[PDB]
Ligand binder design. Structure first.
Ligand SMILES: CCCNCCNS(=O)(=O)c1cccc2cnccc12
Lengths: 353, 18
């Protein structure tokens, strides 16, 4: 067979240790899921420094906690705008997820609070910028570089899916690089906690699995498709399906004919054909062997999964740090005033935030 | 080339969710 006694026992034991880990992780998650934290700071505790970008349904500002000097990334959601866009439940659920999950590659919610006008999610400041920026700056990542990031996403999805969470917005734009060069997943505005099938058309066009586009329902395997898209884009510098307009992108996704740059290794092409697989009886991450079909694939043969989790692997890129509160790794964005009405808006709809 | 097609697509910048 492929493994002798020692290697087979080692792999078996590793796979059982993931099960034990996930069982404890679920216990911890459910306690926070059922009893969320609320109202852990207020706006005048923070100096507003600079806009870092956007997240679903809002804008993200670098802030400095006045009493400590610590910097954070604060997402500001305008309650009236959220109501108009029919995103009340999404925004409540994002905060509920963020305060309940705990994983080394998931951005942490350090504080949350609300006022008459807005909701505020104060997250860790991840100073290295978006993966998107670095990828577009250097064109494409080497396979070892892409694999280091991909491994973090594999582990993160293994964790999330064990909690019945589907992420649904994987893309380089949502992945931030921390000071040690590891990835932080942001934006749970499209995530859903559901067992089995769901139907919502949501996500980012280039990353949608065929079954999201089509009327049929879908499950967590859409995230494994999206991983395929991400790995392809990291290694190629462009995604596997693109076009001028989303409708044309969807046609290409549903057709599903993937082609690869000539520099892709055979191992990479094999993994991607198994992730970018229309047939759900064949897509990796959706089979009897679950996530192990991915983790044990030859393209990941050099990946020490525990060492990635423990953050003991040397990252391929360490972002420059100019000092506390430096934003040199970010684009500049329009600076919008934070206005707080003297009248409470939408109080009943956002009671749970 | 595929890369040139990508550059001509107008979708090389940040992509928003639907
Ligand atoms: C379609 C483009 C999507 N851009 C998503 C990332 N936006 S962001 O960079 O303002 C950001 C967001 C959330 C947490 C952050 C934590 N530290 C830094 C930045 C953060």
């Amino acid at each position: 067979g492929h493994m002798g006694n020692a290697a087979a026992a080692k792999k078996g034991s590793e796979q059982e240790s993931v099960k034990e880990f996930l069982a404890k992780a679920k216990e911890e998650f459910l306690k926070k899921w059922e009893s969320p934290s609320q109202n852990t700071a207020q706006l005048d505790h923070f100096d507003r420094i600079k806009t870092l970008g956007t997240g679903s349904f809002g804008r993200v500002m670098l802030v400095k906690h006045k009493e400590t000097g610590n910097h954070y990334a604060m997402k500001i959601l305008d309650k009236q705008k959220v109501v108009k866009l029919k995103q009340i439940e999404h925004t409540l659920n994002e905060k509920r997820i963020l305060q309940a999950v705990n994983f080394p590659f998931l951005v942490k919610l350090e504080f949350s609070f609300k006022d008459n006008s807005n909701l505020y999610m104060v997250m860790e400041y991840v100073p290295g910028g978006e993966m998107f920026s670095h990828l577009r700056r250097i064109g494409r990542f080497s396979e070892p570089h892409a694999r280091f990031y991909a491994a973090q996403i594999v582990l993160t999805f293994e964790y999330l899916h064990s909690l019945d969470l589907i992420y649904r917005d994987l893309k380089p734009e949502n992945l931030l690089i921390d000071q040690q060069g590891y990835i932080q997943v942001t934006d749970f505005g499209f995530a859903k906690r559901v067992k089995g099938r769901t139907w919502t058309l949501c996500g980012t066009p280039e990353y949608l699995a065929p079954e999201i586009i089509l009327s049929k329902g879908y499950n967590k395997a859409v995230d494994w498709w999206a991983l395929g898209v991400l790995i392809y884009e990291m290694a190629a510098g462009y995604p596997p399906f693109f076009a001028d307009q989303p409708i044309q992108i969807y046609e290409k996704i549903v057709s599903g004919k993937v082609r690869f740059p000539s520099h892709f290794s055979s191992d990479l092409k094999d993994l991607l054909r198994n992730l970018l697989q229309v047939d759900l009886t064949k897509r990796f991450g959706n089979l009897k062997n679950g996530v192990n079909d991915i983790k044990n694939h030859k393209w990941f043969a050099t990946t020490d999964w525990i060492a990635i989790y423990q953050r003991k692997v040397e990252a391929p890129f360490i972002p420059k740090f100019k000092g506390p509160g430096d934003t040199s790794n970010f684009d500049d964005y329009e600076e919008e005033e934070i206005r707080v009405s003297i009248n409470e808006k939408c109080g009943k709809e956002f009671t749970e935030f | 080339t595929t890369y040139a097609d990508f550059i001509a697509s107008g979708r090389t910048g940040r992509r928003n969710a639907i």
